[PDB]
Ligand binder design. Structure first.
Ligand SMILES: [Ca+2]
Ligand SMILES: [Ca+2]
Ligand SMILES: [Ca+2]
Ligand SMILES: [Ca+2]
Ligand SMILES: [Ca+2]
Ligand SMILES: [Ca+2]
Ligand SMILES: [Ca+2]
Ligand SMILES: [Ca+2]
Lengths: 89, 89
């Protein structure tokens, strides 16, 4: 289904994904997604947040997001739980 | 109805109620509720947060709370909108 998300979720949320530390900074309806690799490099992707349709676009990859207070759960469109990412501020 | 709330909502939320500034600090499942009066006095009440049953106890007054990201909406049990308080971090 498509469930509308809260619109005010400014903050800096962190978590882990396939060994990389993820840092999501949300400013309004946009953001940045930063991955910290093993070697210490970082990959930075621009984010847009579609709150009505629950869509998080990271670079050009479409995700689903769910806001639970300080927690943001990020899912693949097929919600493959092997690929779910949990971020917390 | 009774809708369960996110459990991780640490932060400092502010708003206004009947001319007083309200500051809600949440730590885990507890908190403090501070009212700033006109004369500059403050009234401080202890808070408990019942996330499963959506109940916020402020001192000994029972409220309903709804978490929308950085926003916490606090309602009387009869949800009289004349008495709703919106707090944001
Ligand atoms: Ca803000
Ligand atoms: Ca590299
Ligand atoms: Ca998949
Ligand atoms: Ca993975
Ligand atoms: Ca925390
Ligand atoms: Ca006084
Ligand atoms: Ca009433
Ligand atoms: Ca009032």
């Amino acid at each position: 289904q498509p469930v509308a998300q809260p619109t005010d979720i400014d903050g800096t949320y962190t978590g882990q994904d396939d060994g990389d530390r993820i840092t999501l900074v949300v400013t309004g309806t946009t953001g940045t997604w930063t991955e910290l690799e093993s070697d210490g490099d970082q990959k930075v992707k621009q984010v847009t947040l579609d709150s009505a349709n629950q869509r998080m676009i990271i670079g050009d990859d479409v995700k689903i997001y769910t806001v639970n207070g300080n927690q943001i759960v990020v899912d693949d469109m097929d919600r493959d739980p092997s690929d779910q990412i949990v971020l917390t501020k």
